[PDB]
Amino acid sequence: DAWEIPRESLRLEVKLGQGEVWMGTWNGTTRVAIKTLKPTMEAQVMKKLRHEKLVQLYAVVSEEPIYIVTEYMSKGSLLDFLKGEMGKYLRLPQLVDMAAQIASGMAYVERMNYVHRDLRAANILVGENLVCKVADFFPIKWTAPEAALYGRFTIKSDVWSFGILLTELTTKGRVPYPGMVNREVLDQVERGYRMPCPPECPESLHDLMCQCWRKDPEERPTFEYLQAFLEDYFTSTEPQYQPGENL
Numbered sequence: 001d002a003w004e005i006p007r008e009s010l011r012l013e014v015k016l017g018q019g020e021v022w023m024g025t026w027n028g029t030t031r032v033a034i035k036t037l038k039p040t041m042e043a044q045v046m047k048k049l050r051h052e053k054l055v056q057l058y059a060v061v062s063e064e065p066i067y068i069v070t071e072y073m074s075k076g077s078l079l080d081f082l083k084g085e086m087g088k089y090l091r092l093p094q095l096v097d098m099a100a101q102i103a104s105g106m107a108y109v110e111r112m113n114y115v116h117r118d119l120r121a122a123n124i125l126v127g128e129n130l131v132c133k134v135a136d137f138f139p140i141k142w143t144a145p146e147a148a149l150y151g152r153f154t155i156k157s158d159v160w161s162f163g164i165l166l167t168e169l170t171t172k173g174r175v176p177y178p179g180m181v182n183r184e185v186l187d188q189v190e191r192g193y194r195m196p197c198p199p200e201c202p203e204s205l206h207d208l209m210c211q212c213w214r215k216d217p218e219e220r221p222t223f224e225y226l227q228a229f230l231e232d233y234f235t236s237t238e239p240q241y242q243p244g245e246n247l
């Protein structure tokens with residue numbers, strides 16, 4: 001109830017998505033993102049979870065029409081950012097740094113004993129200075145098989161999805177498993193298949209993806225390990241990295 005805000009304190013300026021979400025002004029002073037719920041149905045979670053790489057809730061209005069006020073992320077979704085005009089310029093150091101920020105946020109989710117259940121670039125927001133924050137808004141291609149088949153949604157299954165998100169980073173937003181329909185992916189991931197090394201992407205990084213894609217959930221690394229691994233990627237793992245045409 002301390003999060004409650006008067007309806008007149010919000011100005012909805014630019015519509016962004018559609019269950020809409022707007023760019024707006026709160027107290028005529030603050031740039032904010034406003035998500036609208038149409039008069040379906042909440043975010044007790046967002047009031048507890050506070051972390052540098054979790055996008056923060058600012059205020060709420062509880063009675064229909066409901067409005068969720070969160071901080072503004074100037075670059076939109078990471079999927080849009082990677083696919084858009086900035087993709088051409090991102091190289092591995094940039095992409096690995098974003099992946100470390102996401103792992104960092106997810107490691108906070110790991111410490112809090114929460115699960116995301118839907119980690120992928122579409123649910124990562126990007127801000128100024130390549131800041132990336134994980135955000136909570138049929139994703140078989142991103143879902144760990146034991147979660148997709150039996151509903152075991154662990155932080156372990158989120159790790160599997162981080163592994164897939166690393167593929168989105170290194171292909172600059174391309175859908176994983178190119179040319180495979182949903183049923184084709186389920187069947188082949190159980191037969192042991194996994195995405196190959198993306199072009200120009202070091203084998204050290206692809207190996208990290210494979211640790212994320214281990215069939216045994218308890219064998220995949222923690223987010224604490226992933227965060228640390230990516231934060232020193234270019235000193236401990238690829239000290240010889242030389243820029244390329246795309247990575």
Ligand SMILES: C=CC(=O)N1CC[C@H](n2nc(C#Cc3cc(OC)cc(OC)c3)c3c(N)ncnc32)C1
Nearest residue numbers: 016017021033035068071072073076077135136137
């Ligand atoms: C479906 C819309 C969608 O995916 N996007 C991505 C960009 C845009 N969007 N969407 C934003 C959002 C949001 C959001 C709204 C929420 O209300 C529960 C909860 C939540 O968990 C983090 C995130 C957003 C933002 N905060 N700042 C800038 N742009 C934002 C619309």
